[PDB]
Amino acid sequence: HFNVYKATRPYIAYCADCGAGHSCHSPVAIEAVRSEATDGMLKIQFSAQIGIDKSDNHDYTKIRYADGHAIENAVRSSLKVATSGDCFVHGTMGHFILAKCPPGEFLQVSIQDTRNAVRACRIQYHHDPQPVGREKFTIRPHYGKEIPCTTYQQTTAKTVEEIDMHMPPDTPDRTLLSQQSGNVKITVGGKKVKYNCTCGTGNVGTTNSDMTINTCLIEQCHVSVTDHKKWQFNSPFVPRADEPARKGKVHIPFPLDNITCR
Amino acid sequence: FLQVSIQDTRNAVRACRIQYHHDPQPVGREKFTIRPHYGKEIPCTTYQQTTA
Amino acid sequence: QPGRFGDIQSRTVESNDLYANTALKLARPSPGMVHVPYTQTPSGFKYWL
Amino acid sequence: MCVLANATFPCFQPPCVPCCYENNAEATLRMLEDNVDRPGYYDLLQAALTCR
Amino acid sequence: EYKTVVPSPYVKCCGASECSTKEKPDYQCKVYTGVYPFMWGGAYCFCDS
Ligand SMILES: *[C@@H]1O[C@H](CO)[C@@H](O[C@@H]2O[C@H](CO)[C@@H](O[C@@H]3O[C@H](CO)[C@@H](O)[C@H](O)[C@@H]3O)[C@H](O)[C@H]2NC(C)=O)[C@H](O)[C@H]1NC(C)=O
Numbered sequence: 381h382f383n384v385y386k387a388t389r390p391y392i393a394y395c396a397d398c399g400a401g402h403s404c405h406s407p408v409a410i411e412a413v414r415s416e417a418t419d420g421m422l423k424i425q426f427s428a429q430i431g432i433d434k435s436d437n438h439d440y441t442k443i444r445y446a447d448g449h450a451i452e453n454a455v456r457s458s459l460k461v462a463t464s465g466d467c468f469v470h471g472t473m474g475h476f477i478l479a480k481c482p483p484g485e486f487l488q489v490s491i492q493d494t495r496n497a498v499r500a501c502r503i504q505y506h507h508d509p510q511p512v513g514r515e516k517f518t519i520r521p522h523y524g525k526e527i528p529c530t531t532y533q534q535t536t537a538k539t540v541e542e543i544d545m546h547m548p549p550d551t552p553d554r555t556l557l558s559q560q561s562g563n564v565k566i567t568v569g570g571k572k573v574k575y576n577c578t579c580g581t582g583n584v585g586t587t588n589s590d591m592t593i594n595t596c597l598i599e600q601c602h603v604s605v606t607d608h609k610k611w612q613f614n615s616p617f618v619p620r621a622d623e624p625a626r627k628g629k630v631h632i633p634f635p636l637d638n639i640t641c642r
Numbered sequence: 643f644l645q646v647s648i649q650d651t652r653n654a655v656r657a658c659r660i661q662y663h664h665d666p667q668p669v670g671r672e673k674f675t676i677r678p679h680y681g682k683e684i685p686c687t688t689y690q691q692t693t694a
Numbered sequence: 695q696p697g698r699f700g701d702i703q704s705r706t707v708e709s710n711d712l713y714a715n716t717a718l719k720l721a722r723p724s725p726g727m728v729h730v731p732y733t734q735t736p737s738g739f740k741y742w743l
Numbered sequence: 744m745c746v747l748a749n750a751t752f753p754c755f756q757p758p759c760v761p762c763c764y765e766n767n768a769e770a771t772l773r774m775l776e777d778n779v780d781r782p783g784y785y786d787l788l789q790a791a792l793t794c795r
Numbered sequence: 796e797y798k799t800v801v802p803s804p805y806v807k808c809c810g811a812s813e814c815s816t817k818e819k820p821d822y823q824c825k826v827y828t829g830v831y832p833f834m835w836g837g838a839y840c841f842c843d844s
């Protein structure tokens with residue numbers, strides 16, 4: 381069947397603080413948190429999509445994440461989501477993770493890097509659940525009524541939902557310029573890098589292989605990997621490549637459904 | 643309170659906890675919890691890592 | 695009115711037309727960042743609840 | 744009901760069948776980026792990224 | 796309850812962009828001049844200001 385998560389990639393966005401009070405571009409940036417389920421279940425949204433390995437195969441243990449225009453994968457274990465206490469992870473698919481957290485004033489998600497280094501993001505969120513009914517109990521009893529309530533299910537059938545997707549912008553880089561002696565070289569690897577230089581009418585246009593300048597210094601030429609060929613996400617932390625926009629559509633998992641609470 | 647602990651030679655935890663009432667309040671006129679991605683810049687003071 | 699009951703009003707649950715009034719405003723981005731800051735009065739339905 | 748340039752083909756049977764993405768990824772994506780307002784989008788997306 | 800939709804910003808390297816009006820509920824659009832954004836590996840839009 382359709383494997384829609386083949387034209388999508390993890391990306392790198394700007395997280396407010398990475399668990400230490402300092403801000404840096406993390407691969408596990410947190411987008412909006414949705415909590416319209418009565419029993420108190422959250423739909424946290426990553427940036428680094430999970431459940432699908434680097435080779436675009438469904439795996440229960442590998443999750444993709446972006447690392448400098450290069451995709452790797454990390455073990456699904458060590459995916460820790462927490463609030464004032466320590467949450468419980470229910471669902472896992474795509475960008476979205478389901479959790480039931482104790483009350484608190486923030487939440488963070490983190491996972492080990494390829495070299496086993498924690499990559500965390502922390503967002504301010506006032507979580508305080510109130511169970512359906514007229515009593516503010518904590519855990520379910522072994523004798524009681526049944527009251528209707530709503531929750532997020534684990535089904536991934538047709539849902540009638542949308543995410544806007546677009547092609548990634550011209551990612552800039554500077555580690556690909558190497559000044560040897562009065563000339564620079566551009567690294568390759570599949571990245572059809574775009575360039576713009578000021579030295580002697582310069583050079584406008586995109587290459588696909590190595591190139592030499594022979595004329596000017598480093599601080600005139602530039603690297604702008606274009607990539608394309610994969611939809612990223614429509615996030616406010618990463619720019620667009622064109623004014624009239626392109627836009628796509630993907631269905632989010634875990635719809636909302638009726639159950640009964642005790 | 644707070645406690646500090648670290649393993650012995652034989653991997654036995656050695657601990658010590660002291661009573662301490664900790665309740666920080668950020669500088670300014672809002673008692674926010676973590677820093678935003680858009681705001682003002684207010685001076686403060688902190689301990690630096692340098693050992694000069 | 696913004697911030698109270700019926701800030702956004704839809705003539706029917708399936709109706710396409712929508713009237714929203716929540717004092718959405720945009721602010722200049724900080725130097726060296728890409729974030730599109732904005733400010734908005736919170737939902738009127740939640741405060742009515 | 745979907746259109747490509749001047750094709751106007753049914754969305755259920757795109758002209759790229761089969762392996763639309765594998766043959767030409769970028770062409771497939773730019774194809775899907777003009778049908779977002781067409782009601783027959785999803786069935787096109789079903790066919791576009793499906794082949795054995 | 797409402798839901799604020801914020802599409803990704805459009806940064807024009809070495810140029811100027813013009814705002815266009817649309818028929819959307821509570822639409823807001825503005826253009827800011829003199830930005831010098833940054834990304835993870837380096838700051839694109841070579842033009843200084
Ligand atoms: C590669 O980078 C150079 C900058 O080093 C870009 O040149 C810049 O081009 C823009 C418009 O194409 C210029 O903006 C306007 O130019 C007119 C020209 O008369 C001027 O009157 C305006 O006041 C405004 O500056 C900009 O000046 C120019 N910068 C220069 C020459 O240093 C070039 O566009 C880049 N390549 C591509 C393909 O965009």
Ligand SMILES: *[C@@H]1O[C@H](CO)[C@@H](O[C@@H]2O[C@H](CO)[C@@H](O[C@@H]3O[C@H](CO)[C@@H](O)[C@H](O)[C@@H]3O)[C@H](O)[C@H]2NC(C)=O)[C@H](O)[C@H]1NC(C)=O
Pocket residue numbers: 530636637638708
């Ligand atoms: C949980 O159960 C409730 C009720 O058991 C579901 O609400 C029901 O949703 C259907 C939508 O298919 C409503 O039908 C609608 O009827 C109106 C006419 O009044 C029509 O214009 C619509 O096109 C649609 O056919 C139904 O009225 C509504 N029930 C009530 C009492 O309002 C709910 O969808 C279930 N699922 C959840 C909450 O996730």
